[PDB]
Amino acid sequence: PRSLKKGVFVDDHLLEKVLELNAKGEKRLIKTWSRRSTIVPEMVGHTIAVYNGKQHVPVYITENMVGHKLGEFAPTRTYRGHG
Amino acid sequence: TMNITSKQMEITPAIRQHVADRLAKLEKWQTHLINPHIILSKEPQGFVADATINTPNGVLVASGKHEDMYTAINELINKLERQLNKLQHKGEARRAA
Amino acid sequence: ARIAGVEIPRNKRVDVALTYIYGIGKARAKEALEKTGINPATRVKDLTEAEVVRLREYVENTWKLEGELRAEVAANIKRLMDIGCYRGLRHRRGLPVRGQRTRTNARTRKGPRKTV
Amino acid sequence: GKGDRRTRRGKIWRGTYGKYRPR
Amino acid sequence: MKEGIHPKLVPARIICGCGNVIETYSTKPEIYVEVCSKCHPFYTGQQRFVDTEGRVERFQRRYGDSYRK
Amino acid sequence: PLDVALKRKYYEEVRPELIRRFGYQNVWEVPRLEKVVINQGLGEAKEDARILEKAAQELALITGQKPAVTRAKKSISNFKLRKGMPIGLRVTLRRDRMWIFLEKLLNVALPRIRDFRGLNPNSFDGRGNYNLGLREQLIFPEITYDMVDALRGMDIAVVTTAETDEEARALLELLGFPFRK
RNA sequence: CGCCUCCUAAAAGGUAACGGAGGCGCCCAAAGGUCCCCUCAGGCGGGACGGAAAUCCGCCGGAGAGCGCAAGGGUAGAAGG
RNA sequence: GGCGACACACGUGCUACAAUGCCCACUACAAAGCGAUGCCACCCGGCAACGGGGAGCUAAUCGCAAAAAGGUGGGCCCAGUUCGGAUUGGGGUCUGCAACCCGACCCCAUGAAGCCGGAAUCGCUAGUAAUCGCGGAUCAGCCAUGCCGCGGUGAAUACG
């Protein structure tokens, strides 16, 4: 995965929205186009709306879903099986 | 198994299955119809049903053309039948001398 | 139930024999036999009950094993499946996990062929 | 073994180096 | 007991790998076992064998704090 | 009678601790072990190699006592069972032998169980007896790998003079039966 | 179409109809004699494989089980094992 | 975001099922090409990917570089294995603004199918086939087991 030497990557433009929410006293739904962003320990408890290419999918974040990316919880593909 | 390619056209599972039904006419001769391929297409003047099939005694390669697709599929089958039958009985033609 | 829980094949070289424990490859095998100071060439059937208890004692304490390892791997997938992440989902369908193609192949995850 | 990365033979084929094939 | 159908019970020493020795009775005088109540993890208070982790995951990742506020 | 360590442990350590813990007014009211009844429900020997003389042997080594055979009360279809067929063994350990068995079960056997995480707290009767099932007989010090043809488990009943589950727990726990929760 | 069991059959016996329902034409060398011993089905709880039901442990359980076969009578203070 | 979907079907290939083989170690013999935010000797950290140093070279000078099969020695002993390397868990490295979908690589662990393949069917007549490795275009990286080349070792058989 991303190299330990370099950062733990978050788009800066979401981190701000996250930080702004901590201070003012949380919390509202946060639309984003950042499937690439890591979920970060300060994101826990939010419910972030992740774009999949069609919808912004609501994802409530938990302490167990921390190091993962955002897009891991907003499926890109519709599949109900064959025939 | 059974393979149909519909070229620059949209066709239904209904139509697909109908092709399987027609092609079945070949099962008459009781020889292995190996990996048969039906190709359906639409020229300006009408449809085309192409097919290439390998059997233990050779290959069936033929083509039907008609204003009507269903009719083209049939005309294909005729040619396939004729060839298949030539394969199956040509060997008998020289048991004397 | 020799070491640890499993009875490692006699007749064979102890370095190969130790591989017959879940969670111990070529590598971990090379490592136990140095740390307990015994010849990897010796057949298991030729081990001092001493050399054995050493081997046993080290390995059982150094590395997570047999059932206890499988439990973690299950627990690992357990959670991945329940947080509902994509790698979790692929498990949830028995499908491939590592971004492989599924238009053809993919048989080891799927099972042998399932006719339409 | 050309498909077993964990051997010499494996790494020559993959075009790489490592523990099992050093440089 | 009925004669001739029952294996004899004699004083017997069960020797464990911890180096424990048990004075008991068996149909075999000397036995060597790989484990016992004296050295088994579940028995030995709560000897957390190999995995004294405290999970460790996942809040407990911590590499690092270097993303900014 | 034999001096066997666990037997003595009962009279020395467990006896009194129990009288403390529940306050009995009578020497006979305090919980005793009555019998340990070991059963191999088997029937993997229904027809096949109905030589389970092999198992009767194994049990006879473990308990120091030769089991007697059990046979089916009624004929049963789906298990392939004609009435009168040898499907099980049962050896009834009492007194000294019961103690000797329990000693090794507690000291050596249960330790040797794969992924052993403690006996089951809930396997109690409600009239104060305990039952527990083994998956293999390699658990006992007497049975080596070398000598076994095929893995077979067993049922162990441990029968107490206790009237209640709560009392019987104390007895077995104090004797050293490891309970998980 | 002979034989057995129940009902009809009107509380002794008997009692008809092309009245209502079922069985027999065998079997068992033990499934016979005798001595000794043993007691069921079923319910709840507990117990590796093991399940509604295999075998084991506990409690309750007079007989509802068993008794070669139909039915009836009998029957564990045994006719049952 | 998709082109990477996955009840299925077909074509092309890779790697195998092993002892004329597999692993470890030591040791040989090519050719064609490529190379200035480019190839990178040599030293250092790290099991390693790689990281840090840092010399040379507009290159018949300097580098990619080790060719591999081969040779010597040592293990495996016919076992789904010291065959095979799929799948999965975990830990890392690098490119890149960014590796969830969806990169490659490394290491621990996992260690599938597969015991030579029905009907059918392909290639090749000599430095060919078979087997073995190396380069290049594209290109940040790379899903290349593809393609275009290059040598190494080196057969069988043709009545007709």
Ligand SMILES: [Mg+2]
């Ligand atoms: Mg044409």
Ligand SMILES: [Mg+2]
């Ligand atoms: Mg292993």
Ligand SMILES: [Mg+2]
């Ligand atoms: Mg891929």
Ligand SMILES: [Mg+2]
């Ligand atoms: Mg895919």
Ligand SMILES: [Mg+2]
């Ligand atoms: Mg290459």
Ligand SMILES: [Mg+2]
């Ligand atoms: Mg209970």
Ligand SMILES: [Mg+2]
């Ligand atoms: Mg009791």
Ligand SMILES: [Mg+2]
């Ligand atoms: Mg044993």
Ligand SMILES: [Mg+2]
């Ligand atoms: Mg008569």
Ligand SMILES: [Mg+2]
């Ligand atoms: Mg009457």
Ligand SMILES: [Mg+2]
């Ligand atoms: Mg009457």
Ligand SMILES: [Mg+2]
């Ligand atoms: Mg009357």
Ligand SMILES: [Mg+2]
């Ligand atoms: Mg009257």
Ligand SMILES: [Mg+2]
């Ligand atoms: Mg009269």
Ligand SMILES: [Mg+2]
């Ligand atoms: Mg008799």
Ligand SMILES: [Mg+2]
């Ligand atoms: Mg009688």
